[PDB]
Amino acid sequence: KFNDGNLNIAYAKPTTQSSVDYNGDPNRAVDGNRNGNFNSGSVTHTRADNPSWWEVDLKKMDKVGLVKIYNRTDAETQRLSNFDVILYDNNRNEVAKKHVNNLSGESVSLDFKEKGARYIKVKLLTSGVPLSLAEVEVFRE
Ligand SMILES: CC(=O)N[C@@H]1[C@@H](O)[C@H](O[C@@H]2O[C@H](CO)[C@H](O)[C@H](O)[C@H]2O[C@@H]2O[C@@H](C)[C@@H](O)[C@@H](O)[C@@H]2O)[C@@H](CO)O[C@H]1O
Numbered sequence: 001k002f003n004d005g006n007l008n009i010a011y012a013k014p015t016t017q018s019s020v021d022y023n024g025d026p027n028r029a030v031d032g033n034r035n036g037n038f039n040s041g042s043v044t045h046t047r048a049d050n051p052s053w054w055e056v057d058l059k060k061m062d063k064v065g066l067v068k069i070y071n072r073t074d075a076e077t078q079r080l081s082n083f084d085v086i087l088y089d090n091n092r093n094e095v096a097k098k099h100v101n102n103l104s105g106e107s108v109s110l111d112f113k114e115k116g117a118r119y120i121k122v123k124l125l126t127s128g129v130p131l132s133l134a135e136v137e138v139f140r141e
């Protein structure tokens, strides 16, 4: 649960996603393993949904600072493009959203500046594309 020596409040939290394919269960994005090789077991995978999404539930309202999203790296890296990262409160009202067009490297870092939220959803905006995430780390600052 510590990453770059900061408390990752997403680690081991309940997760869900739009569907599962290739046994890529949503808990693989909070297993503390940033390995983005799908065949190594640490990467999520949905079916080609309308659209595909993944979410972590922090179980209670918390204050969200940095969210770091680690892509799949072995193949199909471009799938993680044209997507929203959305924070929802305890009643599933949208409290903040950032749009990411694509990644220049293996991850993206977003700063939600202490926004109060319970859920963090990663939602592809291109339908018919599987969502795969190696890891999603969430910090309080
Ligand atoms: C470990 C194993 O044998 N599982 C199979 C996967 O390796 C297959 O993935 C495709 O495999 C080729 C080599 O033959 C290459 O690694 C491709 O990148 C890979 O395909 C991608 O990954 C899949 C998980 C899907 O996301 C697919 O849409 C990608 O294009 C898969 C698919 O044939 O079958 C497993 O059984």
Ligand SMILES: [Ca+2]
Pocket: 028, 029, 030, 031, 032, 033, 034, 035, 042, 043, 133, 134, 135
């Ligand atoms: Ca992982």
